[PDB]
Structure formats: structure tokens, C-alpha cells
Amino acid sequence: GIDPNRIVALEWLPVELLLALGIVPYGVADTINYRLWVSEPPLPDSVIDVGLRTEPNLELLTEMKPSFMVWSAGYGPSPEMLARIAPGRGFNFSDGKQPLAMARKSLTEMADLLNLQSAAETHLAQYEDFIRSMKPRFVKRGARPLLLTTLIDPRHMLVFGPNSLFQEILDEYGIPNAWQGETNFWGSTAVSIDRLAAYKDVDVLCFDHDNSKDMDALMATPLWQAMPFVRAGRFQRVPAVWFYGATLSAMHFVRVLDNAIG
């Protein structure tokens, strides 16, 4: 990626990787929503919005003349297409089973490209140590399963399973993941609200993303108020945390998690 000050990130996974290594993205795709879903690692205003991650402004990119472009494999524009604009590397979110393991490999791979190996090791130690330190904040609330969700629309909820970013974190804290059903490669799946009523005694967190109008509509339905875990006083609305990120998204989760049930 030769010039570190001229790198364009076309997805929020690799943005997080750059950020953790100290790089300021020359460009970033969809900075507006990044505010609503990722929120953490805020973006310095200098950053140039290159458009939607799905349909980036190819004209702009060409004028920009990036030194290198990073993206998330299997998502967004075709790698063949892109490489026609400037050099770049696609990064994997997961191997389909462990996203955090992959994140650590992606962070290292990123560093290597930029010769920021030291900065990578410092972050990783900071990271592993921080996860370990918070462990005792969840020793009291024993084996009660936890359910991670987020509302997509009044009729659908996303649940995060065993192969989601948060799973490894749960494993290290001993929090059983209430969702053992199916999940896409990214670790999640959309379900109908009713499907959630099946969860009697469990803790439920729902990441917000500037969708309060949507939440109210949901909390307005008799089904929701009828929800057992709701009536049990186990439902919580927590701050947005990106579900398809890396180490900064995991550390952001531990924060929200800590505040929510620590």
C-alpha cells in the first residue's frame, strides 16, 4: 500500500483495521451510516466519503488516484473491476466459524503490507489484555444465556449466533449464547419477532442504530409487550456496535456488554 496517507477503505471491516494500526483513511465508503452502525473509531472530518460500499463513486476514486484500496472479501464491487482503479487487497471477515481469529490474522496482514508490525503487536496485546481484564465483570451472572439482536424493521430482528463476532467473547466470559439456530457466513440471521417469544428466561440486548421510530413501533405491538423476556425485565437497548468488524468492534462490544450486564 506504498503511501499510507492515500489508502481508501471501501468497507467498514478494513476501516477498523487501519484505525487500529493508526492510519487515517484517505477515503472511506459510506461515512454517514458508519456513524449510525459502527459509531466508535469516529472518522476525522478530513476523510473523503467515496460513496456507498455497494456502489462506490468510481469516478471520484479514479480522480483520487489511491495508492491502495482495501475492501471486505465477498462484499461490494467485483475485485476484478476494482483492481482496474488502483492496487488493493480484500480482507476476510471470517472463515465461517471464527471472525475474531480471522480479525487477528487480518490485522497482522494489514500491518505487514504497511510495515506497522510493531503497532500491530501493541494493539493485539492491548486487545487480548483488555478482554481478559473484564472477565471478572461477568462472574456473578452465571449460566443464564444471552441473546444478541438488532432491529432491521418492525417485523424482523437479527440474531447473532455461534459464528458471529461476539461468540468468542461470550466463550471467554462463559456467557451461553441463547441463539443456536442457523446463521449466514457473517454469523447472523433475520427472524420474525414471534420467533423470539420462545425465549423464556434469557438476557436480551438490542443494538440501536438511529432507529427509535422503528423501536417504538415494535415496543407498541402487543406481541412485544407480551414477550416473556420483556415482562421478566431482561430486555435492554444498547448502543450501536458493528457486528462485522474486527478487534475494535469486539472491544466496543465488551464495553457495551459490561455496561449492560456487568
Domain parsing of the chain, residue ranges:
1-91, 92-262
Assigned fold of 1-91 = Rossmann fold (3.40.50)
Strands 68-72 and 7-9: parallel
**3-state SS string for the chain:** CCCCCCEEECCHHHHHHHHHCCCCCCEECCHHHHHHHCCCCCCCCCCEECECCCCECHHHHHHHCCCEEEEECCCCCCHHHHCCCCCEEEECCCCCCCHHHHHHHHHHHHHHHHCCHHHHHHHHHHHHHHHHHCHHHHCCCCCCCEEEEEEEECCEEEEECCCCHHHHHHHHHCCCECCCCCCCCCCEEEEEHHHHHHCCCCEEEEECCCCHHHHHHHHHCHHHHHCHHHHCCCEEEECCCCCCCCHHHHHHHHHHHHHHHC
Distance CA(41)–CA(211), nearest Å, equals: 21
Residue with grid cell 462484499, as numbered in its chain: 75
Residue with grid cell 496485546, as numbered in its chain: 125
Distance CA(17)–CA(47), nearest Å, equals: 16
Residue partners of 179: CB distance under 8 A and separation at least 6: 147, 148, 159, 160, 161, 162
What separation in angstroms does the CA of 69 have from each of 41, 119, 202? 19, 20, 42
Residue partners of 176: CB distance under 8 A and separation at least 6: 143, 144, 145, 146, 170
Same CATH topology for 1-91 and 92-262? yes
**24-37 residues labelled b (16+ CB within 10 A) or e (exposed):** ebbbbbbbeebeeb
Where residue 45 falls (left for φ over 0; alpha for ψ -120 to 50; beta otherwise) is alpha
**132-144 residues labelled b (16+ CB within 10 A) or e (exposed):** eebeeebeeeeee
Distance CA(73)–CA(96), nearest Å, equals: 12
Residue partners of 99: CB distance under 8 A and separation at least 6: 93, 163, 164, 165, 167, 168, 187, 244
Expressed in Å, this structure's resolution amounts to 2.6
What separation in angstroms does the CA of 102 have from each of 32, 74, 160, 165, 198? 27, 15, 17, 10, 33
Structural method = X-ray
Assigned fold of 92-262 = Rossmann fold (3.40.50)
The count of C-alpha atoms lying within 13 angstroms of the C-alpha of 56, restricted to the half-sphere facing its C-beta, is 29
Distance CA(102)–CA(97), nearest Å, equals: 9
Residues facing 206 on adjacent strands: 149, 237
Residues annotated in the binding site for Fe(III)-coprogen, as ranges? 37, 53, 72, 75, 93, 186, 242-244
Residues annotated in the binding site, as ranges? 37, 53, 72, 75, 93, 186, 242-244
